Structure 1
Amino acid sequence: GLFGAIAGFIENGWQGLIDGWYGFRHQNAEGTGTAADLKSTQAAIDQINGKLNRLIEKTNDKYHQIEKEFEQVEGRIQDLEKYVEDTKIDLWSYNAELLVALENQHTIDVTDSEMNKLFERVRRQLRENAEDKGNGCFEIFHKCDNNCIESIRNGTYDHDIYRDEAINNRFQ
């Protein structure tokens, strides 16, 4: 995908993440944990179900049309009737093929994008207190207990609290 996160700098997905599409996995002094991120998850889902719904009602209510099966050849008029129907089917089959390819290309870029947005959001919360390890992970240069971790996940982490400790760890 365009952002190079999913199937990119993030090596693989997590089968254990079963209550969301995106999430956080951490390790600190008191253990490890995995938690889903609701906002990123909902944003992806909203955009995907949006496509679904636009798709699943244009109107095709047709009654009297033309004959489309014939027993014996008749010539000119029958040739035209068959050509019109064959023409119509090819055009609609082309539409269907292109539509799914475009939508799928977009869907995959959207999900890759939402993964990157989550990564960038967290990057910005951490400011100078963390470094990108290159695999979707940040090394956090200060003690960060379970409450600290949760503050990052819920967006209340105040970088200024840990900045002096982190700068000292990072650069000396």
Structure 2
Amino acid sequence: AIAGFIENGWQGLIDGWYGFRHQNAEGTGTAADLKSTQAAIDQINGKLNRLIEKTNEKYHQIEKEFEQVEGRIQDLEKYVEDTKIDLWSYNAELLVALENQHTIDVTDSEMNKLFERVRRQLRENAEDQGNGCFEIFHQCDNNCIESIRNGTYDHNIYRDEAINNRIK
């Protein structure tokens, strides 16, 4: 018995981030979907690119460590640097937390786009089972499963067979 993303993920799937898993009379199989995978991946790189850009270069700055107490001017120098450190520490905590919320949103979306893409291909020939899977109401051999996966599945071919299996 097979399920989809609604239930849980797939440790089985090792050559892609998303993919199809099918059952027909010829057997059962798992294939990865390249478009959806590269979609997600490409936004993880682009933000990994936005982070290794080093606009931070600093030669002569100010003293940050002291040997004797001095009062006013030392107190200020210590304050300026401690203020700078606090503000960048905040920027880092927020940036990472906010990137990460985006990374989750983008990947959750690409999964749903993949599901809806298949939904559209299948028209009135399949019903959504509720578990991230479609029950296909016609015989679908291995060539037919591949057509769904490579985007050439012509729903008109099977519409009569499938509608008659759904309505009676």
- Shared fold, TM over 0.5: yes
- Residue 122 of structure 1 and its aligned partner are, at CA, apart by 0.3
Q: Residues 58 and 84 of structure 1: is their aligned pair in 2 closer, same or farther, counting only changes over 3 Å?
A: same
Q: Kindly state the Cα deviation for residue 36 of structure 1 after the two structures are TM-superposed.
A: 0.1
Please give the per-residue CA displacement for 1:94-118, whole angstroms capped at 9, x wherever unaligned.
0000000000001000000000000
Deviations 1:114-170 (A, max 9, x none): 000000000000000000000100000000000000000000000000000000000
Separation in 2, partners of 1:12, 1:58: 39
Whole-angstrom CA distance in 2 between matches of 1:6 and 1:83: 61
Identity %: 96
Aligned pair partner of 1:82 in 49, 74, 78 = 78
8 Å contact kept, 1:22–1:41: yes
Rounded Cα–Cα distance in structure 1 between residues aligned with 2:101 and 2:3: 14
Q: TM-score, normalised by structure 2?
A: 0.97
Selected match of 2:127 from 121, 125, 131? 131
- 2:122 & 2:156 partners in 1: Cα distance? 10
- For residues 145 and 98 of structure 1, the distance between their equivalents in structure 2, rounded to whole angstroms, comes to 50
Q: Using the TM superposition, give the Cα deviation of residue 58 of structure 1 relative to its aligned residue in structure 2, in angstroms.
A: 3.7
Give the direction of change, closer, same or farther, for the CA distance of 1:48–1:6 in structure 2 (3 Å limit).
farther
Q: List structure 1 runs of 4+ shifted beyond 3 angstroms.
A: 5-9
Distance 1:6 1:45, change over 3 A: farther
TM-score by length of 1: 0.94
Q: What is the CA-CA distance between 1:8 and the residue it aligns to?
A: 10
Consecutive unaligned residues in structure 1, runs of 5 or more:
none
**Which of 21, 28, 32 pairs up with 2:17?**
21
After superposition, the C-alpha distances for 1:71-100 in whole angstroms (9 at most, x for unaligned) are 121000000000000000000000000000
Task: Please state if 1:153 is matched with 2:129.
Answer: no
**Could you tell me whether the CA contact under 8 Å between 2:3 and 2:131 is conserved in 1?**
no
State the superposition RMSD in angstroms. 2.4
CA distance in structure 1 between the aligned counterparts of 2:3 and 2:48, rounded to whole angstroms: 24
Q: 5+ unaligned residues in a row in structure 2: which ranges? A: none
User: Tell me, what secondary structure is at the counterpart of 1:55?
Assistant: coil
